[PDB]
């Protein structure tokens, strides 16, 4: 729904500004995966350190959605699980959207 709520024109322009001003960070849109039974997330736009790993970003989501650690969280990009050890800069480089943002989804088990 991020894409539905913001025209492609405006998405592209905001991504260009952020990449110019904060080159050591990655603009990420985070949304809950379709049909997932875990909590929706309040804020969708995250400016992430390039060196942050996927696994470390799982902890970020956990703190927002206030999910007990007994229950697992998985991050997807383009419907596939990226490696936990991968740095956000790498996922961006390889899977960034045409609008300049990286789109992530998350779910539980």
């Amino acid at each position: 729904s991020f894409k539905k709520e913001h025209p492609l024109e405006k998405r592209q322009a905001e991504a260009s500004r952020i990449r110019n001003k904060y080159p050591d960070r990655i603009p990420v849109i985070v949304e809950r995966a379709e049909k997932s039974d875990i909590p929706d997330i309040d804020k969708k736009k995250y400016l992430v350190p390039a060196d942050l790993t996927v696994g470390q970003f799982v902890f970020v989501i956990r703190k927002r959605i206030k999910l007990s650690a007994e229950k697992a969280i998985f991050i997807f990009v383009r419907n596939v699980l990226p490696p936990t050890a991968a740095m956000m800069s790498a996922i961006y480089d390889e899977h960034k959207d045409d609008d300049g943002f990286l789109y992530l989804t998350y779910s539980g088990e």
């Binding site: 603009p27 804020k43 736009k45 400016l47 350190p49 970020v60």
Partner: peptide
């Protein structure tokens, strides 16, 4: 506004 991690 952006969330900053």
């Amino acid at each position: 506004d952006w969330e900053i991690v």
